[PDB]
Amino acid sequence: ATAAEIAALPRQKVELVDPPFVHAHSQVAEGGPKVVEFTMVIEEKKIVIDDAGTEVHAMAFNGTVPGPLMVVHQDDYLELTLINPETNTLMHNIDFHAATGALGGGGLTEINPGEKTILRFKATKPGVFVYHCAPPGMVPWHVVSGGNGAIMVLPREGLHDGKGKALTYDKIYYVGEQDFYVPRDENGKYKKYEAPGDAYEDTVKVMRTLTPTHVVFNGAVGALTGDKAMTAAVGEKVLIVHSQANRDTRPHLIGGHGDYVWATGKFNTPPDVDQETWFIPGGAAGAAFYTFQQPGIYAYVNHNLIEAFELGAAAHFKVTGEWNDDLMTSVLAPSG
Amino acid sequence: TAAEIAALPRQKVELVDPPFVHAHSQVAEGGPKVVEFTMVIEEKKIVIDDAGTEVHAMAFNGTVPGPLMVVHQDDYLELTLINPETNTLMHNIDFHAATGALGGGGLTEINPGEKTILRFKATKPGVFVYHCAPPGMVPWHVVSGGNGAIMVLPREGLHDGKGKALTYDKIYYVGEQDFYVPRDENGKYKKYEAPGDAYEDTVKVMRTLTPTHVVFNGAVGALTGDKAMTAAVGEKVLIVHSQANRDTRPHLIGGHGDYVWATGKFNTPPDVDQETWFIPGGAAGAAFYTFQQPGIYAYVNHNLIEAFELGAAAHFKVTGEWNDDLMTSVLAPSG
Amino acid sequence: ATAAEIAALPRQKVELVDPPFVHAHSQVAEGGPKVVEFTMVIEEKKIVIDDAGTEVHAMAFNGTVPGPLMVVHQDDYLELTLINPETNTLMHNIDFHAATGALGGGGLTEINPGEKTILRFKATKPGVFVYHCAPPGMVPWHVVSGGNGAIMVLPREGLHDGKGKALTYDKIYYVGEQDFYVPRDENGKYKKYEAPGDAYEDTVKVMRTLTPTHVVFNGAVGALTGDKAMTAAVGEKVLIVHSQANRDTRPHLIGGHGDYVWATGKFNTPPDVDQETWFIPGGAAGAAFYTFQQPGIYAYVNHNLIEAFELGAAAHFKVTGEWNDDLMTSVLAPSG
Ligand SMILES: [Cu+2]
Ligand SMILES: [Cu+2]
Ligand SMILES: [Cu+2]
Ligand SMILES: [Cu+2]
Ligand SMILES: [Cu+2]
Ligand SMILES: [Cu+2]
């Protein structure tokens, strides 16, 4: 497609929503290829990542950790306006794993405080894909400070299973998983810093242990629990997109399954089925499709259970509806 | 319907200790059945290495791992779980094969002196982890040995990707356990009077994400020496492998995984000709192999530090005739 | 085949080349089955693995870490002459994951200094496969000292995608990824030793933490950057073989993709497609096929970014050609 051809394509401006929600889209593409426009301001901000009050200086695309999910269709163009406000102290950029060239866009989007840039790429491959910050020489520090999210490049025809049957979800959630490396004092208590750069040396030491102090969903321990639990109903079809930009994870729906799981995240790779626990390598996104059959509380976890229940990587689903005794029943309740 | 489920046959099955598996048929015998199992949970001090290191283990049916239960797709598994009054802790069970109530965990919380009976329909074919999961103390029970697996065979037995039958002559269940044993200032592993005394010290070790031991069948060397698994040349063997908490990467040294259901799910077509497969923590996998050479094999987690320094190494002793076409020493070690 | 049948097959002596290059070979088999002869001399040598002058006592098959890629076709015989020179101090051997019996050949190739052996095995299974040293009682030590490489057993008809279309590479590269465990003194400086055995006790202690001090490609930090950057051009099809004999890795071509990825490394298992980041478990090799579409510098990494950019696991590709503005364009360059 020539420059003139692309200029004639229709533009749609998308308003992003905060994870774990996803902006309005259609599963099946409406019309021909479009240039889909997004804007994100990068915020360097203090975030609290557990109930004790532990804080991190985060790099937060659109002001959240993870950054928001951008959704386009195959052969659309994604056109991102990225802004680094003058209140920030560091240079930032963006690497789209969905994109082709210039280190995923990273080499073309280095913006100092008070600068902006507009990057356009053709989303040639269908799937979910990580994006993250990657300033040369400081790449892992920015990513494990929360500077990451994902996009979904839907097939123009929507999702299908491995054999041509249409899969249509009723709702979608995006779970970004973040490994944090928080320095401690000699008493074992987490340290606080005045500016991001003050934490650098101490944080690099922790990073080198390859052992996160915290592993969280949506930026904090318990962020997707309580009144922030994800919800569904018996019979409802849900797609769960999960990303990890730096470190392996193994998602599991406690009480459910992944009926179809694109564990590599790429829709031209047929999904695994009937999954108990799937595996997403660091630097990737995956997606899992499930139809709820039972009501009640579910936990969605990284099934290294230490990571889930000691380090923070557990969310809840609240599910409404009628219990199915054929699928499961307590023949004898706990009794003497 | 309600009448139809109640009229299905009930069948009690006697369990056996890993790595062996109780009696079953690969192709389902009859229509759907309710397969009944009973397991008593034993809290017991087990020795896990050659230095006398102890762990207060949670042992479904008296073993780490708990035994393999085997049913067919659309059978019901009906487990009676018993927690004797001599135990100190509440326990329960989460079947990854099951649907609802946190895998059954929500319905099976039994204090010492209690029992429960859980039924679920095995709707999905594959091998699946089960483990204890008391709310608020889930990892502690699991890394204390409270885990095993089940196999839900397709009603028509196993098949390859093109649909030809795969029929094993024997089956072994290897449960892999990451343990996190506290050490004192001098580097000696600590011992405790009761399970709860170890809790605080153990969680500290757990948070390093670095096991002190990684073992098969509950201890370093449990499946080596005189306890090696066996086969013969020409024999087809299915090896079911589970890890309820932590990744592993099985490898049969001297062999391969001819077909590997690496995700453990039989509606997902098996990978083939595998050197080393990968099972994420929280899952089981299964590998089918036909032995072609006699001799000693090692079956390991192929992080070789985990295998040979931390304990995740088993043996197969295989009888039969050596095949010089497949391998031959042209010139033996010589100066 | 009988012993007589094998004796009658053509012999072909191959001359090995150092990683990341691969010796001359045909993708499609030239003729019927042959016995492909290789020779390698094991060298115990010091290698410097970072810019702080950190040393490892390496076990180098053919003088390199990793050892070289050996290439045959399915149902050929690989015949290795392995030589342990008198100048070495330790017994060594070799286990081919591609082979069947005697612990991959390890039980038949145990050679003290001043000894040699010849092993022949039938390459019955197509794929990329680890090989490594494994002296009973000292296995992990030899492997994490650099005693590993890989082979490729091509299908006789070359590579194909999942539907039987031919996949033919113009270039091939072999990246061996190595986890090292280097002891430190009490002030954090890496220790040096005058003999391999002198470092055993100290090294075993570090190995037991399951935390490498270094994770590198081709034996050292930056080994595959600068004078040793891999090269390609726009339009060229490139196969990247990647091995890790002891520890998981998650390769990613920054700016690119794995168009087809045999993540398990086995060619009768259909490849994944459109991959961002693939996964190779410790003890295995994998392979990725990609057609370059953009020029410039790509980084090729283990996408645990701490492992890539703090511990050493990053390579570069230098790619010539014309930039493609359809696939990617800077609409607005970084600016106030
Ligand atoms: Cu940044
Ligand atoms: Cu990346
Ligand atoms: Cu328990
Ligand atoms: Cu579980
Ligand atoms: Cu060696
Ligand atoms: Cu090996």
From Swiss-Prot, chains A, C:
InterPro entries registered for this protein in UniProt: Cu-oxidase-like_N, Cu-oxidase_2nd, Cupredoxin, NO2-reductase_Cu, TAT_signal
Positions of the Plastocyanin-like domain: 1-172, 173-336
Positions contributing to Cu cation 2 binding: H97, H132, H303
One GO cellular component, as annotated: periplasmic space
Pathway: Nitrogen metabolism; nitrate reduction (denitrification); dinitrogen from nitrate: step 2/4
Description of what induces expression: Under anaerobic growth conditions and by nitrite.
UniProt key word Flavoprotein: yes
NCBIfam families: Cu_nitrite_red (TIGR02376)
Name of the protein: Copper-containing nitrite reductase
Organism for this UniProt entry: Alcaligenes faecalis
